[PDB]
Amino acid sequence: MQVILLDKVANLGSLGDQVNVKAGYARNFLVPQGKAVPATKKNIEFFEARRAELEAKLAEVLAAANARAEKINALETVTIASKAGDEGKLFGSIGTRDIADAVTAAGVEVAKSEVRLPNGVLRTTGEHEVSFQVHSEVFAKVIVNVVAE
Template structure:
């Protein structure tokens, strides 16, 4: 049994790792394929230190994004209710439906901040009234807001 070699990937390799990852591979795989193709570099103490610093910066960036998302979640919940106005017919039924874009527009009008419409989850809205909507701000942060559907 030969020992494994540590290499730093210069490109993403399927089932091995992403660009900048420190991985252990068989010596033959490293010397015959990865290094000659320019896909990886042999890991030295200096390169390992750079990889660790890059990972630490990435962790800080992810943490800052999450904190910003949590602050926005708190701001959305502080506002409490967003009003969406639609044309109303008989029996308090609305014409059409309330879309995620309608909710995004109402949030932008109230808070001035953008929300991705693909992250908005709405129940079926067919009448005027109050509804709960889920807004995914960050992969780990979801806010629940109240939507009031009112007549024009």
């Protein structure tokens, strides 16, 4: 009595792993009560393909926009900047919508502060390339051109 699981399940469960359980536990609890199913061979492919059409399928369907920064590998036109201050140094900060101002017409338009560098944001030269939140993995690269007026 092997059977494959549905839900988690105490000392064996795993959403679909391949356990061998005592007959009784099964035909008396696990099954007829939605938690497992006979390992009927017809099934070990029925619940093995998913392990293919998914764990190797949709785990690949993720890669369709590498780094998301495709043809943006040559920086972006500096429409304005991101500010400055302290007669030479830096003084001004980025509002909850002020790192787009420069790259404010490139890809698509948004306006939120998924902050990534929990520092006082260094005040020096100007043009830097960290990463920012583009996704749960990849990154991106561009620069920042101030405004002399």
